[PDB]
Design a protein around this nucleic acid. Structure first.
Ligand SMILES: Nc1ncnc2c1ncn2[C@@H]1O[C@H](COP(=O)(O)OP(=O)(O)OP(=O)(O)O)[C@@H](O)[C@H]1O
Ligand SMILES: Nc1ncnc2c1ncn2[C@@H]1O[C@H](COP(=O)(O)OP(=O)(O)OP(=O)(O)O)[C@@H](O)[C@H]1O
Ligand SMILES: Nc1ncnc2c1ncn2[C@@H]1O[C@H](COP(=O)(O)OP(=O)(O)OP(=O)(O)O)[C@@H](O)[C@H]1O
Ligand SMILES: Nc1ncnc2c1ncn2[C@@H]1O[C@H](COP(=O)(O)OP(=O)(O)OP(=O)(O)O)[C@@H](O)[C@H]1O
Ligand SMILES: [Mg+2]
Ligand SMILES: [Mg+2]
Ligand SMILES: [Mg+2]
Ligand SMILES: [Mg+2]
Lengths: 257, 257, 257, 257
DNA sequence: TTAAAACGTACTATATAGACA
DNA sequence: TCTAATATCTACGTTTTAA
């Protein structure tokens, strides 16, 4: 059924080429080329994870005849309170090696071997605040002993964690600030979402003054809020047999925040 | 419906470029250029807040890609009995940073860190008389360690607070006094309100010298009285089916003060 | 461009060798030789901080290869409500050490260890009235257990704090008073500013009675008022296109105080 | 392409004969002659690891007939929370003995066996604060049982760790303080970096008053920051087809710190 | 079986830092 | 005046290994 297909589409996710994504990718290309360790910092739901995820797809593994893959970018998200072994597990699994059970030292040695062997040059650690204090020493050694740019991605909680150890603070001084949407950039973003994400049979004109006021108030400039509001409002409108987001459906969703 | 929209327009606030606002804005430009700390003082409802608010909107943040915003002017109104962590939290949140739970020393260092880098050069503290005596020492250190023109705004209750601390009084001697207004510029201001603010379909002729008399007696030269009387007179007159504000309604309002 | 460069200079700070600075330095040199604790007291904006900075800058940290630096004079300004660890952190970070997380006892032992070996002989605590009552016991123990001249600096607020602990009062009772300027010294100080600080392209003649009499009334002999008035007056005169401070701008500034 | 060769060079590392490196090496020569155990302490990114690693390249293993190679200096960096087995493994592996599986007592006896006969006379343990308090007993026994100068290297955290064991503290009392760069030595280092490290087609004149202020603000005297900033600024400038680091690029890099 | 090495997480003993009366 | 809490700071001992 068309409705079930449209709900299945709007239910999911998609990547939109926002300008802050291009900013990050160009900045990560510099840091990867200079092989330079750094941090990406920005408040929650500003889009940091989707942007870093888009970067590893742009720099997918590359192949040579009869050789292991070169994997320039490794992207991992640690689990909460990540110790050394869980960091080493995360990295080696991303490189597609099922490391046989063993000591932390055995996991460390195998991780160094595959980080060298697969030609990894950038290691993005998303939610780096989830690392234990003892684990940043292993992250620093990967940065120092190998020619690898390590990127710590997090909120202002990461900035607070990093300040607790001079040796991490001084290795990750360079930062990019991921920011909220506002002003005309927000209005351009709303229009892109209508045309590219929602793709409803009839134009909703979300950029118009009253609609834009509702969205500005409810989203507060978070791209996470903008995406979740408009997708649910699109699903509610189509479930009611409407061909567009209507103002009443939008305010009804916006009133839940 | 006509009425509900215009009532909602009159129910909201507006800004008008009065000569007092223009005078303050030039004075603040001099102080910001010189990095001179100073105070703005004057009776309630003389328009100090609206003038200081308009100054930050005229000097809005500049964004550049992947950096924290360049924010030349920060404007804060402290909560009552503001301590130092409250003050630091206000400044960091204005600069679009989330505070992380920590000591006063941690909040201080994070605020000093982002007052740099965001490139702040003026800090306006509206109703500075809400500051605890201990937090004035952090205000003074922001003014002294960084190149920041701190502007204290308040009534004469601010002058009472700062005269009790020698070191605060001497740092904030330079001041501008907001005045109540009467006669010619008052007559112009009344005319400016009926021209630019009330926007009623039919002329109220508040320029009339007898209408100016009753407004002189009630508004007593306070712009915050003048605005509130005319706005209240508009809503009553429109709701009573009148195209106009006239003395029969205007003096019913004016007698209410 | 011309205007921005001279303004960016004039909004800065500069240190003029007043006789008030020399008498402090010759006094602190005698106190340092005797290792004698004492206090410097005087009204706000009399130049106490700038003179103590000048003394600290004449007695530089001396490097010796691979040794910790020999630092004869430490200068600290406590933050407000300075407790023992706050004091110890500021001392040990003035010497080129990081604090490690630890107890008050760990911070004390490390501070006493580095005040020795850095060879400290005078400690200046500027705005010593910010010290908590409890932390004066550690200040007294530094002055008693090591042969260190502790110099407390503040206004009459310091005498109000000190007199409430007779053990502190009786150790820091030797004092020096910073005065208001007056007379021929005030005339001589004004003469220096336009040629040693302002250096506008044309003479301002600030010594002339019609200027000198206004500056007397506006500054009252506070060196901080004298400096900040003339710097702002030069900046405003330049911004109007003038080669010099005119008395019209001098009156335009002096009326703001 | 020439650009890829220069970026590949600038992306790397090099050892500059800084005077503090010479100061350390002269000190380690005295301690190695005396077989005296000691510690090296200084802030993060001050160059301690580069200077220690440079020492064990001067004192590389010997080639000798019919006898195992004399290796005067062993250098190891423990992994985080290094226990004694991991200590012994790193020492034997540095001496190129592939020690098999065994008990800790086997690893101990085999380490003591190869520290003799290789004729080791100095052992440098970098990041010595990573040692468990139980493995410090084996370090002390290496220094006591054999005539070996053990050098413990770390930041101020190492001083705190050593304080917690009387028997370690009294064996490593002698120390060298590795320092930050400042003053004329910083200007000399920026000059040395442009000549010896960046080797760009045209002089960047980074020693100049304008550039030296930008570098001092960003570098704060940390050699680690100096090297990172200048190499990345070079790579940015060459990628833009400049022949040198322009101030516009240097400020653009420095704005990230 | 027999060291003995590696390693998840508990019932505790304190050492503060600071919103309020 | 007097707390919750975010740790520190060892131990609880319990698995895993290989010999
Ligand atoms: N580039 C994008 N294109 C489309 N949707 C996006 C994009 N960036 C963010 N979103 C939407 O915003 C949501 C939140 O983004 P994201 O997961 O990247 O946040 P984050 O900044 O990593 O947050 P947190 O710090 O809380 O983990 C996404 O799940 C998606 O709905
Ligand atoms: N320039 C202006 N343009 C339009 N309305 C104004 C202006 N100045 C004042 N008002 C009106 O007067 C009211 C009071 O002004 P404002 O809030 O600036 O006073 P204030 O001096 O900051 O007062 P207080 O000292 O009591 O806090 C405003 O909320 C608005 O209704
Ligand atoms: N010797 C000097 N040369 C030039 N300017 C000076 C000198 N002394 C004081 N000033 C000016 O006066 C200002 C105030 O001086 P300073 O900070 O030393 O005063 P203070 O007595 O320590 O004040 P407070 O007690 O308020 O902290 C300086 O920032 C500077 O503008
Ligand atoms: N002598 C040198 N010549 C060239 N570059 C140097 C030199 N010393 C330091 N560096 C640069 O500074 C960086 C930091 O130096 P190093 O690793 O030796 O610091 P560290 O003091 O051991 O730091 P930490 O205590 O944080 O581990 C180096 O990786 C290199 O980029
Ligand atoms: Mg995320
Ligand atoms: Mg107000
Ligand atoms: Mg002072
Ligand atoms: Mg190191």
């Amino acid at each position: 059924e068309w409705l079930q297909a449209e709900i299945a589409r709007l239910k999911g996710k998609s990547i939109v080429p926002l300008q802050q994504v291009k900013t990050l990718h160009d900045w990560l290309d510099g840091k990867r080329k200079a092989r330079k360790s750094c941090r990406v910092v920005g408040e929650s739901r500003t889009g940091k994870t989707v942007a870093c995820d888009a970067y590893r797809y742009r720099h997918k593994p590359q192949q040579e005849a009869g050789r292991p893959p070169t994997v320039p970018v490794v992207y991992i998200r640690p689990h909460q309170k990540c110790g050394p072994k869980d960091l080493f597990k995360k990295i080696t699994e991303y490189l597609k090696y099922r490391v046989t059970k063993g000591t932390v030292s055995d996991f460390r040695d195998r991780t160094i071997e595959v980080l060298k062997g697969c030609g990894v040059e950038m290691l993005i650690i998303d939610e780096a605040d989830r690392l234990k204090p003892e684990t940043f020493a292993d992250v620093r050694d990967i940065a120092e002993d190998l020619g690898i740019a390590v990127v710590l991605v997090g909120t202002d909680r990461l900035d607070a964690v990093i300040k607790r150890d001079e040796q991490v603070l001084e290795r990750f001084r360079a930062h990019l600030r991921f920011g909220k949407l506002s002003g005309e950039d927000f209005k351009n973003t709303v229009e892109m979402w209508e045309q590219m994400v929602l793709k409803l049979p009839v134009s909703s004109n979300l950029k118009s003054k009253e609609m834009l006021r509702i969205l500005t108030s409810a989203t507060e400039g978070y791209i996470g809020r903008l995406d979740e509001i408009l997708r649910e409002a699109a699903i509610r409108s189509l479930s009611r047999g409407l061909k567009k987001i209507d103002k009443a459906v939008l305010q009804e969703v916006a009133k839940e925040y």
